[model samples]
Target: RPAFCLEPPYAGPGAAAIIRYFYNAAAGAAQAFVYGGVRAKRNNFASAADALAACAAA
Candidate 1:
């Protein structure tokens, strides 16, 4: 599973909503990248380092 870390913890109303927004944004970007890879017919990463680099670039 993917994980997210927030610094200096949120201290306000709507914290759950804020975190959900962050997760959704991440998932959307990941989905788009994977979908594009599939459509291009070369979706597999050659290494974990490569995958991490791609995710960071995304």
Candidate 2:
């Protein structure tokens, strides 16, 4: 697992969220594993680098 790309809200997964980037040969890219609201989300990109880029962009 990669590090969080942004500083999530201190209040937790209600108003804000967390974005992390990682490498998954089977899953592709865009490591936008967000944790917010009442659900968890996953995103994809071109590659691990792209995922990290997306995370950084998050």
Candidate 3:
């Protein structure tokens, strides 16, 4: 886990969250957002496990 890693209210195998590395989103140093679960809303998450199973496989 990242020093700045944060798990959402529902976090685990099925639960998911969106994460961005770097203490600050600065100067091209900001890491791409990491999603624990998704259907790729690009800024949101899906509440479906089927989505979690593959959704973010992108």
Candidate 4:
């Protein structure tokens, strides 16, 4: 399993909806994983760092 932290805690239905879309898209796509939504403009340094690290590790 992986660990993650969210900024503003990820409110709104957009996140859930996007995740669902990704699930469906991944079923037919050849990608390793499907990601949704945009990164927070502020208070998201940790998230950006985590993403960078994950990509680097991959």
Candidate 5:
């Protein structure tokens, strides 16, 4: 099954929160895992540095 995965905003602490919330929700529901074969290079760096920094502060 293929789905449209949207990259979250690359800036601000809220981004991390949104991600964490979504991740937790999905994990709790046992529906957060991604499985495929085409490993895209872009996936290596999904979130921007600013997003990490913001998350650290948050």
Candidate 6:
């Protein structure tokens, strides 16, 4: 999986919630792969969430 960043002006708290939702979704998908005994690239999801947090702060 590839990492991605969110752009600025995130529409405040509502957008943050939306971002969190997608991040959790990605994490869940990664966990599913792990349950199947696969090497899930969970870091990609964390990286995306980190980027979003940085953007939200800005």
Model 4, range 1-58, lDDT digits (tens) per residue?
A: 1233222233233343232111111132212222334642222233434444433334
Per-residue lDDT of model 6, residues 1-58, tens digit only: 2233221122232212222212333333321111222322333233444634533333
The C-alpha stretches of model 4 lying farther than 4 A from their native spots are 1-46
lDDT for 53 in candidate 2 is 59
Clashing pairs in 5: none
Per-residue CA lDDT of model 5 for 1-58, tens digit only, reads 0121233212232313222211122222211223232333121222444323333233
TM-score of each: 0.24, 0.25, 0.19, 0.21, 0.17, 0.18
C-alpha lDDT score of every prediction, in listed order: 0.28, 0.43, 0.33, 0.29, 0.25, 0.28
Tens digit of per-residue lDDT, candidate 2, span 1-58: 3434333322235655545444343444444444444443343333557655555444
Ten residues in a row with the worst lDDT in model 2?
3-12
Model 2 misplacement above 4 A? 1-16, 35-58
Ranking by TM-score: 2, 1, 4, 3, 6, 5
Which pairs, if any, clash in model 6?
Answer: none
- Looking at model 4, which ten-residue stretch has the lowest summed lDDT? 20-29
What would you estimate as the lDDT of candidate 4? 0.29
Give the Å error, residue 40, model 5.
26
Q: State model 6's lDDT.
A: 0.28
Predictions: Cα RMSD each: 14.7, 9.1, 12.3, 9.7, 13.4, 13.7
Q: For residues 1-58, could you state the per-residue lDDT of candidate 1 as single tens digits? A: 2233111122233213211111122333322122221212222244434434443444
List where candidate 1 sits over 4 angstroms from the true fold.
Answer: 1-43
